[model samples]
Target: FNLDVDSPAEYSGPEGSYFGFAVDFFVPSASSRMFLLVGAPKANTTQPGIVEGGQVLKCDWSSTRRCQPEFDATGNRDYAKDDPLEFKSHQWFGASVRSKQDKILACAPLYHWRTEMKQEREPVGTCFLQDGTKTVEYAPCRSQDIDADGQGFCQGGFSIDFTKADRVLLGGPGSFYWQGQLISDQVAEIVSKYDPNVYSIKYNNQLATRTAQAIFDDSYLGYSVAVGDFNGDGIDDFVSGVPRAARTLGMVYIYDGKNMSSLYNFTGEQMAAYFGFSVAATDINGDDYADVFIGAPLFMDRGSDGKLQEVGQVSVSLQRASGDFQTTKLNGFEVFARFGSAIAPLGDLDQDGFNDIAIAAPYGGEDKKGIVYIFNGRSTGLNAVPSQILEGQWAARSMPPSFGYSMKGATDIDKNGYPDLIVGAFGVDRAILYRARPVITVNAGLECFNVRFCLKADGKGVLPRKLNFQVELLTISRGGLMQCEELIITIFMEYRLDYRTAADTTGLQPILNQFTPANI
Candidate 1:
């Protein structure tokens, strides 16, 4: 139902918790120049059962906005927690400066959910910011008494614990929660005074066809929300790993920038093995298609080893039934050298044409200490065994060490043709560089077992018993004669031989035991 609360609108506004504002509204008008307003309580009242402590940003359904009286006669600001008031406060109202050209004309709080004025919509919660200097007295207890402690705001009252609440409106502004919180306030305050009816609340209203909206819900109350094309469908989507809700299950949403449509869900069943966080997109396997990679660890018994291991992960295309990606299993996945290891940021190390993989692990075993794995790209089309190229180390073995998370970069160093690698020391503040030698040649055969079959050292056969055979040969090339390369061939026979002592000892006395197999 669409409803607007301002019969006689007045701009009401409040300074946000930290250094922002959340008490103003933005109203898109049907007229040429639209106006906005800041809203607050007319006076402290108890109508909503909560005290109208400070200014709050107002929002409505019809794209009309303003800052007006936030308090009714009962000193209630309609902040009944159980009711979905969908109130949004300015993140930074004081810092934003208004100009003659801005859209805001007035500021005030208006009734948004009633169907009469076409203003009811989903109301989003307020986002808090770092209060650089401004002081606040947030009391968690509806009746928390003031303590006798000398601390000004800390006496007896429970401050607003952001841990139990979400702080900022999602998709409102800036990349950071701190920055966006402030920016949301500025935007709300800019519109508060001009119209005194428009507000930024997520509610159901009929008059608003395309009312301004921010996509994230303050459930876990994250700082900011991400909007991007996740399913390769060219539509913006969301992927948040909050602790609970469907979000806890790795729930991802496909949003039309106004409302959200369920795209994929991460249930505890599907994610029973994982704990998820930050997300990125790339072609991890070089299959010419973008794939998603979310950093996380396995939560269940992942391997045969008896110890609990924190494994990093690189999720490949799991939608095999849909065939969205090139491979059902990931074309490439890297694990730390130890079992139960996870690979993330499996990316380019030297920024070369080839992509690399990295995994940070601490308890992979003593041989596999706190380290990162650098997986060089395929040396051939088919999967080939990779040799031990190089290894990295953590500077300190003690707990709570610095540089615990080292970065692995694959890029061209020294301007050489091959890509080089940089190994970060987790415990130490240093990084070591290793240049890649792409063309590694191996001449390994015949070195450990190289010999020519020669005379036997046995008395049972015609060969001399235990006689050492020394054969000398010369090869004549077109230009000159060259002696054979020096070689010491020791051949042993199975039996003894009787060679006459009078004959030249070099001839039949020590001939190769061709009759018997020589152990060369």
Candidate 2:
């Protein structure tokens, strides 16, 4: 895994724009290695016969390190070059790849409702295979209205979950609609209700289950769903977000793996909290039980001067051994610092026993360049202050780019023990991969370290200049396995020099050679 340090590995299809919104990694098999799925929800095709829809690019890490158009979700390859059609706008908003039995399942959720005024073609969720084979196209919600003009709105996929092997779950946040027609004296049935459908599950290209309309109706209940074992049980349970519920205060429903009625619900304390904008679960406390992280990008908080403001918040519900949960709030009281827009678990970034969390504030900073904060994991929980904050002049535009629009941790593209970070700044049309620099200590007492050296050469025909320096420890490692016998040091250097002649670069060659440390 060699990659550029400052600038990480990036990829996009030929028709570029908003290409890196969603990304996921899949190990085809235990021995087959890993591949990446880059979602270009805005990618379109104007060619004749080819349907216009978003594309999901499958980039195999084993092949060309860069992604190409060999494999895609929209498998309609037979098309003319000059044809034009209505922009389907089937944006592949979310995607995931997982292995089930002998076959691999690829799911890409499309959120746009592309139905004509008089047509009955309601939007449906879709799934595919690793070889670009379409498998599933099923609706999670059915319209209650019999009229063609009343066809349901956004009836299908908003996000796809592959946490369970038995089935694939699809979320539909825009399932139902309301028309204020009649609530008259004799007519008690004319009043309408607008509630979103929960979700639908498919078992290998066939519909296995769909949540009951009665229970799923709750105004955007299926906005997001993630799978994990939150109760310390062996089976994988799931949780759904209803960000528009309770007048936008938000609510989250946690369901048992086998039973839906047996569940727990959590809601926001304030109005318009939008507590369920994003939901993810992981074992953050090293307790084996999965804990949940809920994002409320519209949450409000008070500043030290005692003024109320909207800044966003994230709640981490830590699961206990007894199947109970404890909550911790990551608050961003300052205005426009939407700290909880996206969240992901980082697996023991500092080699600590506990797993860390990465929180993104895409609208943070004075210039709104977007920021990502890393909270170091501890035995008790995560530290309040971030261990690391990432931001800078990476984007080309004058205004700041939404750098933290999406993020994924615990990705080791190099197969290294340490976890890596991948970020998608959709506003700037770029993706970045941050490689982890791990500290290796061996049994022979030699410690491997990453040393960055800045060299300066400024004198012309000057006598020998002597400089003295002492080594100082800047940081220390927490813990890890130390059985290796040799230490390998990795170094990066920057030079600032005034060359006396075109071929006078030899003066710095010996210094560079001596600083290069090899395994011993």
Candidate 3:
């Protein structure tokens, strides 16, 4: 089945809720129930002492209920239970959501943490994990003995990834004076994994200098994260984007998951290109090793006007058997489109064995409504030509669309065999679920009025499906001596069910509407 972007199912929250900031398909292992978790990080709640704290709404197949709260995190902080740092105002709880093994982890990087003074607060961030009927709160920064002296100054959960095993990876890009690091949460131990010695250095133009010792603020390594086995070792590897590193040229780091040691880093070619704004890892070439896809949403290039424009790009770092990578930059078509604001593996929408990918340009389209491009995977890499480009619908009141603000996919919500896509139009406060529809390819052939067409449906479905078609043939070639007649032809063909055994005499007469010919 193909993704039915034309007839998507829309779900909405209140205005300004930014309902679709994040989304995920969840199926708890305990039961057969399934749900679509929608993030409304700006959604207003009436919880005590809460204001715009954000929430994740779970949508199910219930006809009466549109979406309900998956959890309630907005509440007045009790020092008896925690500290003043737990006072959540703009915690942005639903900023990120991820699912693994019947568990869902939702995070708010802006969640505050108490300083040693116990009165002041810093946005050290926290995550809420929901497992079945149990909910666990994790704010590693809170437990750590940290003060404003730059210890545990992290805004964790900026980005997150769930490994194949029972573990999770959190990106703390705002930690250590915004130097950033990756946090790994194993079932027992939770630690922020990075070389503190490398970061925490004070600097003015030091990051610009790229001096080995000057990994300071604005370097922001954990802006995006992805887990893949880049080396083909059967062990998961971690990849992160450092968009503010190297004088804003941006960089991406790959680390071995076994040791949390940095393997290699890729730097952006141009300053402010923001090369690592997004990252995804999949076997684009069907290789055992996972290739990395990086987005540079603010990337600039000379436009058709011969001037620099922020036309964004998503590049592929194809991994070789030797664990090295070959970089390839995919061209962005429109200027100011923010072409690669987000990227995700879209599963095999084309059923080509290799996994496909979807990329979004949140500011793209005629109305700046945003756009999504789907690339069918190939043996070597992705096809440079996109299979489809879907533009975000216009919003009310001349506001921006921002449809492609974020996206989630690789789920079959309609119970169809084909995987579907879920998109967030936060600006419009809508979460859209696009189902993969059945594809019927028509191969038509005509030779001197001998018109023939073969309809082939590609995907699992009942046989002998109904296909309504229109055949219009027009030609413009006439010579005085050639003696070609004006030809007008119309045709309607139908396949009667049961090989004409059924009482379907109702559909045959409307088949043909005539032809004049160039020959005789």
Candidate 4:
């Protein structure tokens, strides 16, 4: 029964099933908007069984009998005595919104699969298929408001011309994985086709083998793939993180046409708290040597018994016993530039002779609110104090949901002559370009070691930024079954500072982009 135009009805009896799905949205790409389609399949309880209530029975309006045949819920065969027939599919609802504007522009009923087909099998378990039978297709609404009359399940290719139209690949309902893979491939294909400057990046799943070996040393964890040049090769290579695994080692792999393995791995305890990891092939120490700065925002001091323990901070307002108070696992560690914040990137912040490490720990303690640690390769002779280059700057303060990530290449945000740091923080509407006036200058050469994308800005997220810079780790030469056995790290920096920006704002974005093969 459809309720008329926003009518409020009250139910005197027991409440009926109104299932829901909850979610959150973060960074979105430019030029595209994103949407989340929600579907709630409803069912009617058929007959009551002796031991358990019988399963749901669906209705088929086309057939003379309003009900469709149902099979056993537990097994594929016909239900036994007192067995309940279950209906798996039903009507669905979808909601779409823009991440940037944080507003719901449209809502609609995409599709409704009232009845499902029964698969013949031994003790038939539930069957889910996208045979185009039970899918939904939404009506096209030019305005933000969803089409009220449009019907069908939210189709896979439901996309608009918004550049930030990146979708989250949720591996739900078992079938969504296969569906998601196709979706990702579709997305890549879409962007590549429309946007000349845009290219799709995908990490080779084969690299997951490192997780089996347990060898992470230089602060990168997990299997990741980005489109960037890690080895300074003209073309992009595969760069992955090797965060410390549970009692196992964590190592980052850079595929340079061959395996130039680094001996670094982390234990699971070491990386459980870190959100994500990123690495820059630029020089960090000004020695023309790109040294690595391990971004561990939340880290615990090693205890005597081989356990990573944290200093107990007594919560003053605890009602329970002191023993009952839960001490932070120190697992909430972040890889910030200052005082071990969560997200820090490598770049020449001060125009210093060498590349330095910048860590941003925005959620630290009081007075310390946020810290940006700059790791200059220079041996400051005096205790090697990390230069507090950019101090006490909270991206979230100015931008509600913003948090810092690794050192983004310094670009001029305000079109000023000085170069600014392109800090991609959370909550910020867009990437903030910090133009820092040069205080010093030096050269930090390329530093290379085995590392993995230890942490993602958001858990299980790929490189979020879809702007001028990107990282890619590729398997140029297939390794077959042992594909993860080899990889190449290629980092690409689209030089879009002065010329590109001017071109874009002036209706003339420079288009001299072409990736060339680099010598590994």
- Cα lDDT, all candidates: 0.28, 0.54, 0.69, 0.26
lDDT per residue, candidate 1, 1-520, as tens digits? 0001112222212221211121122323233432232222222323444333333232232244432322112221333354433222221122111112223212121211222222343112222222212222211111111111111111111001111012211322111111111111122322222222332233221111111223332212121123334454543444333322233443322232223444553333235333333333344445543444444444332445674433444343323235353322121122342211223233443233445554444334334444434444442221222223233343344432222133323233223333333333323323233434322111111126444322312122122222222443221121222223325454443222222441232222222211234232
Taking every candidate in turn, the Cα RMSD to the unseen true structure, in Å, is: 25.0, 12.6, 9.4, 23.3
Among the numbered candidates, top lDDT falls to 3
Give the TM-score of each candidate.
Answer: 0.35, 0.69, 0.81, 0.35
Worst 10 residues of 4 by lDDT: 172-181
Q: How many residue pairs clash in all the candidates, one count each? A: 129, 1, 2, 142
Superposed Cα deviation of residue 183, candidate 1 (Å)? 11
Error of 2 at 121 (Å): 4.6
Indicate the worst ten consecutive residues by lDDT in candidate 1.
155-164
Best by TM-score: 3
Model 2 regions lying over 4 Å from their true place? 1-7, 12-16, 30-32, 46-52, 60-65, 70-118, 129-151, 164-166, 176-218, 396-400, 440-520
Compare candidates 1 and 3 on TM-score and give the better one.
3
Q: Rank the candidates by lDDT, best first.
A: 3, 2, 1, 4
Measured with C-alpha atoms, the lDDT of residue 167 in candidate 4 is: 22
